[PDB]
Curated annotation (Swiss-Prot):
Residues 3-114 form the Bromo domain. This is ATPase family AAA domain-containing protein 2. Highly expressed in estrogen receptor positive breast tumors and in osteosarcoma tumors. The chain holds residues 981 to 1108 of 1390 of the full protein. Residues 108-130 form a coiled coil. Interacts with ESR1 and NCOA3 and these interactions are enhanced by estradiol. Interacts with acetylated lysine residues on histone H1.4, H2A, H2B and H3 (in vitro). Induction: Up-regulated in breast, uterus, colon, ovary, and stomach tumors. Induced in breast cancer cells overexpressing NCOA3 or treated with estrogen. Down-regulated in 5-fluorouracil-resistant derivatives of the colon cancer cell line HCT 116. Belongs to the AAA ATPase family. May be a transcriptional coactivator of the nuclear receptor ESR1 required to induce the expression of a subset of estradiol target genes, such as CCND1, MYC and E2F1. May play a role in the recruitment or occupancy of CREBBP at some ESR1 target gene promoters. May be required for histone hyperacetylation. Involved in the estrogen-induced cell proliferation and cell cycle progression of breast cancer cells.
Amino acid sequence: SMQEEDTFRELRIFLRNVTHRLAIDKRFRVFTKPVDPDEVPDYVTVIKQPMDLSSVISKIDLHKYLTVKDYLRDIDLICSNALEYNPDRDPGDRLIRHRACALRDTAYAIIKEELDEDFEQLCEEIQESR
Ligand SMILES: Cc1cn([C@@H]2O[C@H](CO)[C@@H](O)[C@H]2O)c(=O)[nH]c1=O
């Protein structure tokens, strides 16, 4: 449907806007790009599904997200990866875990305030019909 395509285009605009606001926050810099393999060579072995905000933008533009739920699974992945890969009591690990939790919480709070539930419901229904 042309009307369904308008729905998804609006979803994409909304997701780019949320992702931009996360990406510009200084606390979340570490999550804006894939990690440096030369810097952290065991990362690809420990973390099988790397995710970051640049990859999220790429996925939005590739029409990979048809719902906000599918977007949040990738935000959740950014966060869970950070908790799994940096689990220690040392301050560097604690800092990154705090920042990961904050990224997750911030994304969910923006969505809570700014996503219309009926718009998400529409997206989910279109997705489930395909
Ligand atoms: C996302 C992430 C990053 N880092 C460090 O910050 C650099 C830039 O991402 C990485 O190369 C790594 O040294 C980590 O140590 N753990 C992580 O989970």
